Amino acid sequence: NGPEIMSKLAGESESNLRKAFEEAEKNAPAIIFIDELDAIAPKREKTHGEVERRIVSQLLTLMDGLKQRAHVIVMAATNRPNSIDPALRRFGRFDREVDIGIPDATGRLEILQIHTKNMKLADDVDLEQVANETHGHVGADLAALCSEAALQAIRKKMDLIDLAEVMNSLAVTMDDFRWALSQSNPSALRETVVEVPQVTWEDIGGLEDVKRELQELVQYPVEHPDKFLKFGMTPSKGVLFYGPPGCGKTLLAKAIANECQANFISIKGPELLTMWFGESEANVREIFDKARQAAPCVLFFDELDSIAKARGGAADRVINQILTEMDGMSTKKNVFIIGATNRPDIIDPAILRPGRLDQLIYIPLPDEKSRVAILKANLRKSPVAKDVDLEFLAKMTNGFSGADLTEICQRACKLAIRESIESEIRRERERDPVPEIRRDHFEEAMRFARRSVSDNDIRKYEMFAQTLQQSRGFG
Amino acid sequence: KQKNRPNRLIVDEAINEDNSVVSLSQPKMDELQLFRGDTVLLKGKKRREAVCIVLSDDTCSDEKIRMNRVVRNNLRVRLGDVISIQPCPDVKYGKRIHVLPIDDTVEGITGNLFEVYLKPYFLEAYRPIRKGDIFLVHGGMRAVEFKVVETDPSPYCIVAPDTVIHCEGEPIKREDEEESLNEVGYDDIGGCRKQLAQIKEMVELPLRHPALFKAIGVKPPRGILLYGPPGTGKTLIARAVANETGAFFFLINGPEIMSKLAGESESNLRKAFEEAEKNAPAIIFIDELDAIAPKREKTHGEVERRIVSQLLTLMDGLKQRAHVIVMAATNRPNSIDPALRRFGRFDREVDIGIPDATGRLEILQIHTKNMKLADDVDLEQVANETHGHVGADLAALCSEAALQAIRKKMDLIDLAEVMNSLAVTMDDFRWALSQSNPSALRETVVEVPQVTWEDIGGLEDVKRELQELVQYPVEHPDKFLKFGMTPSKGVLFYGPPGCGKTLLAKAIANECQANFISIKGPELLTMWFGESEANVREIFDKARQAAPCVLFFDELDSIAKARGGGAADRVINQILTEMDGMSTKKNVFIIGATNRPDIIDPAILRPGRLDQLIYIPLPDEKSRVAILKANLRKSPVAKDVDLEFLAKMTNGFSGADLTEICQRACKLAIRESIESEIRRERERDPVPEIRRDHFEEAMRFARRSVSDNDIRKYEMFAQTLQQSRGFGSFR
Ligand SMILES: Nc1ncnc2c1ncn2[C@@H]1O[C@H](COP(=O)(O)OP(=O)(O)O)[C@@H](O)[C@H]1O
Ligand SMILES: Nc1ncnc2c1ncn2[C@@H]1O[C@H](COP(=O)(O)OP(=O)(O)O)[C@@H](O)[C@H]1O
Ligand SMILES: Nc1ncnc2c1ncn2[C@@H]1O[C@H](COP(=O)(O)OP(=O)(O)O)[C@@H](O)[C@H]1O
């Protein structure tokens, strides 16, 4: 370990660092691991002192001391790539760079069976929906969650005479898992997830032409590499998305990466504003290089007009590095940039030039088949029964926002929660839950939904569409 | 708690003069399985022991055990306390005994004390002794105390006639601090129970249960941070878990490590943890962890990086060996080096915080256990106005009150006259509160306020959705395991100048029995202008630690007026980034207050982040009665006017304006009482009953603080809030 070398006195830092390297002279098949090397070799100008430079210099000297003699392998534990100084991680000398990241729902699931294959669960928990949630959780925290579950298994037993009545048969419940999760905290929070999410593409209906160029864009650069090379031109680097602020949070680019089995990294809107306001224009290189290293991922940028709204009181700091690293990027690596912006008038003029971002795909307001698909997605992954209908909404929902329709469904579902509370009151003054909503349970929810889009914004969307509408010739 | 042992009895006075003879009742000796001359083990405080012989006593109570003050001083107990008596069938006779007399009991007498005191006391008596105990042997019309130093049967022994007694001349010093508990009382520390129970569980279940570690898989605690304000009793917390399980405490000061020279600074830690490692029950307390381990940019020096690295190595060297854990005090966890806060290495992190009102009440009770009161104080409203204080400040308060009680006495003959009984009164505590410098001030705290929903009425359907949006998700989550999806993360209040919104928000957390935090608007402006927007993340972290809790925000139009005349600020996007990482679970409810909802950054109105918007109108004419019923306290009157005369004609006035009317009537009433009593002093029972005229000049000497052109903007928001509803379905 690195702090073993750091803990010794001056002059003894040479000891217990080279000593493993002539110990590796004995063993021809051998590896060398240094734990927590960020404390060993940080930025040289960041350190105040000289012994740190001595340790860094002797480690760099003993890196190539075994120049393919014993064929040993050096691996290390780095918390961040920018913690390591760039002189040590130069190419040819300690430069093979892979990553770990955070596990997905299946990874958290496998962590759960690994940590529960030794202990005895009470074989009633699902252990899968638990791993589907706990977003931003290290598997060490999953081990701590299992330890807290066993602690609750001790705790629900009263103060006994210390005999194996509960010790021989450890009883754990799903409510125990949830309450141990409640008395816990994530440490992998506010980090960019590199795993692919799934919505399985059925939840979005309509916009079939938009689906046609979305299957044109990212489905076959690696699925049809030679067929795309029949003409020889490069794939389209960037696509810009514009339309009304409705049904426009996420999951479309996640779906279109999910047919390609590609990773997903989303860039948040206020994350860009925080990096702009905090004068931190160096971490954009880190997240862009992480996105390039997570290939074949497709990027997603949200609310670029918010930076333009901040400039409104066209180019600024965060636009400059985005343009620089987007132009300074190969046409390979299967990397696509998707920009979400509901205000196309205030955007940067160098974005819309072709070669960088060219496909100005317009997303219209959700129509009748789109809202039928939205109610079907609300039926998806949610408990529901029959007598529900959608033909009332043929003129009730003429044109609605998708977020408006989801909060309609959520408010009606919480009205069903309120009538379940009334069923609890029924059980209270007795001394049926009826989870399915009423036939006209949406009737008061009709007064809980305003069309937040104004008609002049639809007019300016039509004007920007007809500005980019092109010529028609015949005869 | 445990019914496995009937050992818990009551300490009572004894009849027999023998120090090695204790008394018990006849029916309770057969339950404890004791013989005629059985030797038992008595356990008192500071895990000390004393071995005596139980004899049957007819007048002894069944629930009580009789002992004299020699046994009582050895067990470090008093009258009315509880001890445990254990039968010991493995007691053997003594081989060698080394004792040393105490210095103050041998002054004036010289010579061989073996043949005068030690020989008739230990001949044909079979008295069992304990190493470290104090026994008194009379002789020569004086009282000479004796203390056991070294025995060849090192745990305990019975003084055989063949036992050689080593009694060479060396006078030992009597320590007055050894008698009082140091500090073994579970109830000695107070005001922390909601987390004291948690930390007592996480240090209790690793102890006493070594075989439970194979069932637990991995032990959850290895190193526990104790962060909070200074003076809250972290040393007393560390001494509280000390000696309650029979584990070695071994307090280690951070300055005591930093004070020594290099090499010696490298020493006294691995020596310290190996001295912990030789014993199986072992705790280590560290004070001033940040003095040992500050931030990396704070480290300008060779030695400190070496000692942080050595602490890191010496912590992760132990891996499930001999169940040893460590606790450390901390100002605030941002100052600690973040490489320490890992998993398997400082994973369990607990907060203490300031004491509550009942907490400061019981802490005042604890610190006034040992001193005599005059029995005239209220002693609860003393603790009620101690806002922004700490337990060290409370100790300073009681010390200054006793100092003022000393100042009641003049310069007397300096003998024991008022030392027999003190006469500290309530105005002494008022004077101590007058010269009271707080420590927890300039720091926002968390507590559960006392409102209980009955101060303000109205909003009868806003309150119902307020319980089923906040309270009932906490109450029953099985309906959320039903058809129910995720609930709303938080709401925002907009309406009048929000003088009622804080009392409208605090009442839920009292009803929910949840915590509350109010981050005020000037603090948010200080976070913007002071370039301290990173600390909002730690504020949200302490909010998540205080789950369940209510996040109160206010005057978000104030931060938007500085840019409206860009849109977002350095703190608005940071707040959005913090609340976007908030889970749908954990019941972390947020609430915002805004006087001007038009000047709002529009990155909050979409659902998913924050969906529900709560409009409130002015308190109407029936709401005047609801506000005036809350004036039963803080301006008490019984019957002088009906409290509906002002509400019958006045069109619109704020409840802030109505309480301004009440406080100005209070001012007029107190003033006319003052010219009622100065004339009686001039001529030579307050009668604080007020009349209608104070209400008359209060209701005429007033001004409606709200503006009418903002109200029509609120019905502009309300006519926006009539929406695109349908008339009805056709089934
Ligand atoms: N399914 C989708 N996934 C991602 N972005 C979309 C989708 N539909 C539309 N968008 C883009 O998002 C923008 C509007 O997003 P918006 O609806 O404001 O987000 P939210 O759903 O969080 O309110 C539009 O400019 C549009 O181009
Ligand atoms: N809440 C409390 N209850 C009782 N005593 C307290 C409390 N807080 C502080 N004290 C007293 O203050 C003294 C100092 O405690 P503490 O602040 O933990 O030590 P340090 O200043 O070394 O951290 C203790 O001896 C304790 O008796
Ligand atoms: N329902 C109410 N409406 C208006 N003001 C009230 C109400 N109830 C109490 N108040 C008064 O408001 C004061 C507290 O105002 P506060 O909530 O701190 O304002 P702000 O939140 O704007 O700082 C109290 O002194 C109380 O007299």
Numbering used by the authors:
A (entry chain B): 270 to 432, 439 to 588, 596 to 713, 726 to 769
B (entry chain C): 18 to 432, 439 to 588, 595 to 713, 726 to 772
Sentences from the study reporting this entry:
To understand how the mutation alters the ATPase regulation, we assembled a full-length p97R155H with its p47 cofactor and first visualized their structures using single-particle cryo-EM. The N-domains of the p97R155H mutant all show up configurations in ADP- or ATPγS-bound states. However, in the presence of ADP, the NTDs of the mutant allow variable intermediate positions, which may affect the accessibility of the p47 cofactor. The presence of the nucleotides, such as ADP or ATPγS, destabilizes the dodecameric formation. When the nucleotide is present and binds to the enzyme mutant, the p97R155H dodecamer dissociates into two functional hexamers, allowing cofactor binding and performing ATP hydrolysis. Our structures also showed that the arginine fingers exhibit different conformations than those of the wild type when p97R155H binds to p47. Our functional and structural analyses showed that the p47 binding is likely to impact the p97R155H ATPase activities via changing the conformations of arginine fingers.
